[PDB]
Amino acid sequence: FNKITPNLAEFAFSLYRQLAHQSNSTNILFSPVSIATAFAMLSLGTKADTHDEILEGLNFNLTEIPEAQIHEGFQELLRTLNQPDSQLQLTTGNGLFLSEGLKLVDKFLEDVKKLYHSEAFTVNFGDTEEAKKQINDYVEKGTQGKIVDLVKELDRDTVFALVNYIFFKGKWERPFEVKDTEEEDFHVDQVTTVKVPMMKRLGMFNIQHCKKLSSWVLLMKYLGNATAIFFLPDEGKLQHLENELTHDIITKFLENEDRRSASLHLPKLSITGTYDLKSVLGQLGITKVFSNGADLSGVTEEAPLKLSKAVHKAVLTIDEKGTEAAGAMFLEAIPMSIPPEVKFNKPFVFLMIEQNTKSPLFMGKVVNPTQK
């Protein structure tokens, strides 16, 4: 089911095409969910233009959807992410860091902790370096060592910092057997290749070839409550795919429960995506909260405040199947017939959708597994 998801979808695409044009030969990885829910939670401390700008920046038509519904929708999602339709290893969090000395509004801190279950702390921004450590420690501790020293530096007038991260490494509901994981070619160019550990499995896959998107569309079911959608653009059809993607078409794929025999070659990789939300979202029109004109009265009533730091870092690790545990052995009726060998051996885009809410958890493009 969906509620605000269409709003999150178009947000994911906007934020994607944003990074896909600007940045050219880089793996892209961001959580449309972690980011939005973060700025939707922050909007609760904003007022007037400053606020409307955030919600509108998150692809929300304020004139058509009651804000009460926007936040209600986000809570539903987090409810599913806390204790879902299944415990899917997801290490996501949002930490706010405000100056020790600001008389923060209790209500906002309520909404942060209770409503959006986000961590908020007060630090001494007088010691710029200590704040970074203090912050980076939070993330690291929270990602249990996967993310280290996220923030490399803070502005001179930093009094409010936002750190948003998400680490995922799901176990395949239908794993690849490590024995078959050999290293193979990966086309970074039409004439150049690179070697990467290529996983492979002959089986009944929810694979298809969409002519509209000019690409092979593979739906990998995750042991948890998320579904991996991979898009392998045709020869020279990457820009087209990126431009033809629509929440509709993706919902069409989700509702698709067919499967056919295919020899899937999917690379093993652990890509990352570190982004400066101030910059990236500013491009989406969210600027007032990050500047001197920020109306963060919900955060702190009497003293000026603005969002000096807003950083996102998404990490996604794909392999044969999480970690060796209850393997659960299934069997598939594979027809005797030349199955299409589908190799994800060239730039491809992809998304991770939470099965229930259909919220885009991760969106990205792998240009080269080698980069991290």
Side-chain angles (χ1 to χ4, degrees):
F1 59 90
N2 324 294
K3 201 166 168 179
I4 71 179
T5 79
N7 296 278
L8 289 178
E10 303 307 349
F11 166 64
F13 297 149
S14 195
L15 185 60
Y16 178 85
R17 302 180 179 110
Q18 179 64 24
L19 303 163
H21 267 91
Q22 163 195 352
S23 203
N24 26 28
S25 256
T26 294
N27 297 309
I28 303 171
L29 187 59
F30 60 93
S31 179
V33 167
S34 73
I35 292 180
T37 308
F39 270 79
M41 167 216 77
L42 177 67
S43 70
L44 304 175
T46 59
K47 295 186 179 182
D49 309 346
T50 303
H51 166 265
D52 289 357
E53 189 179 74
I54 294 185
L55 300 182
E56 281 175 28
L58 300 175
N59 268 266
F60 281 101
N61 186 351
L62 303 178
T63 54
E64 298 186 4
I65 186 173
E67 295 180 7
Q69 271 194 4
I70 293 179
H71 300 305
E72 174 186 10
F74 275 109
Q75 293 176 4
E76 285 291 10
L77 189 47
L78 306 176
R79 186 193 168 302
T80 304
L81 302 181
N82 225 149
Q83 176 48 17
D85 189 347
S86 178
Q87 174 180 10
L88 165 85
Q89 285 204 1
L90 204 51
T91 313
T92 308
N94 202 87
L96 302 180
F97 305 88
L98 303 74
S99 182
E100 259 175 344
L102 297 183
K103 185 187 175 298
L104 319 182
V105 174
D106 305 300
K107 180 56 185 185
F108 177 65
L109 300 180
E110 294 180 8
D111 300 357
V112 172
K113 271 65 185 60
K114 282 171 292 168
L115 292 186
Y116 287 66
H117 318 313
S118 179
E119 319 219 337
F121 315 91
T122 50
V123 294
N124 174 16
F125 286 104
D127 192 355
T128 297
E129 273 265 83
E130 182 59 8
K132 292 181 215 187
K133 190 176 177 177
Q134 222 163 330
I135 289 186
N136 289 328
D137 282 0
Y138 162 71
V139 181
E140 185 175 327
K141 157 191 182 182
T143 58
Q144 284 201 18
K146 200 63 187 67
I147 295 172
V148 292
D149 81 341
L150 185 47
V151 179
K152 311 274 169 144
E153 54 188 18
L154 288 173
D155 300 278
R156 318 77 200 158
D157 51 11
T158 303
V159 293
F160 184 15
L162 188 162
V163 180
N164 189 267
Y165 67 80
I166 179 170
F167 170 80
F168 184 63
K169 182 200 174 304
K171 314 169 185 177
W172 292 125
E173 191 179 82
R174 302 193 181 181
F176 285 98
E177 300 198 355
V178 191
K179 71 176 186 177
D180 291 304
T181 303
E182 300 164 27
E183 191 171 78
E184 285 144 43
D185 289 36
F186 190 103
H187 267 252
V188 286
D189 277 65
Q190 295 255 347
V191 299
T192 326
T193 52
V194 152
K195 305 297 166 287
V196 292
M198 195 67 71
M199 313 187 282
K200 54 171 173 295
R201 183 173 79 88
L202 166 71
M204 302 307 285
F205 290 95
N206 189 159
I207 183 71
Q208 46 274 149
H209 184 281
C210 191
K211 282 301 182 184
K212 183 152 195 171
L213 297 170
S214 298
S215 30
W216 278 101
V217 181
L218 170 72
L219 279 71
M220 292 282 287
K221 52 278 143 169
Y222 263 124
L223 185 66
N225 49 305
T227 295
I229 309 188
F230 298 104
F231 303 93
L232 184 60
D234 280 4
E235 194 179 325
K237 288 281 183 180
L238 177 55
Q239 184 62 357
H240 175 101
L241 168 69
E242 302 184 318
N243 299 322
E244 299 310 322
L245 290 173
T246 75
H247 170 228
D248 186 343
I249 298 176
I250 291 175
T251 301
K252 199 175 300 173
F253 291 125
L254 290 185
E255 306 298 6
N256 178 214
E257 292 176 22
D258 291 306
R259 292 176 181 276
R260 62 159 170 265
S261 70
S263 302
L264 178 71
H265 287 73
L266 179 66
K268 181 176 176 175
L269 76 180
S270 52
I271 63 170
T272 317
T274 317
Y275 301 100
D276 176 6
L277 298 180
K278 173 175 168 186
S279 170
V280 71
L281 294 168
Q283 300 271 311
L284 287 170
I286 302 179
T287 56
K288 214 172 180 172
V289 195
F290 307 91
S291 191
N292 317 296
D295 187 336
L296 296 176
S297 312
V299 184
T300 179
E301 295 178 8
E302 239 39 64
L305 188 61
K306 71 179 177 183
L307 198 47
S308 317
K309 211 72 207 294
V311 182
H312 179 82
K313 186 178 174 67
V315 192
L316 171 96
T317 295
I318 297 300
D319 68 6
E320 296 84 11
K321 187 181 179 157
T323 55
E324 193 184 351
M329 318 333 277
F330 58 91
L331 270 169
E332 300 180 359
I334 300 182
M336 57 198 234
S337 49
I338 285 300
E341 193 163 43
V342 178
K343 305 182 191 156
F344 277 77
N345 65 346
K346 61 176 174 182
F348 64 88
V349 313
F350 66 97
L351 298 81
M352 276 66 203
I353 284 79
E354 193 284 301
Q355 290 178 6
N356 297 292
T357 62
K358 301 187 179 179
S359 305
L361 281 167
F362 281 92
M363 181 158 196
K365 168 176 63 176
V366 177
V367 291
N368 194 338
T370 301
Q371 168 186 12
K372 182 184 180 182

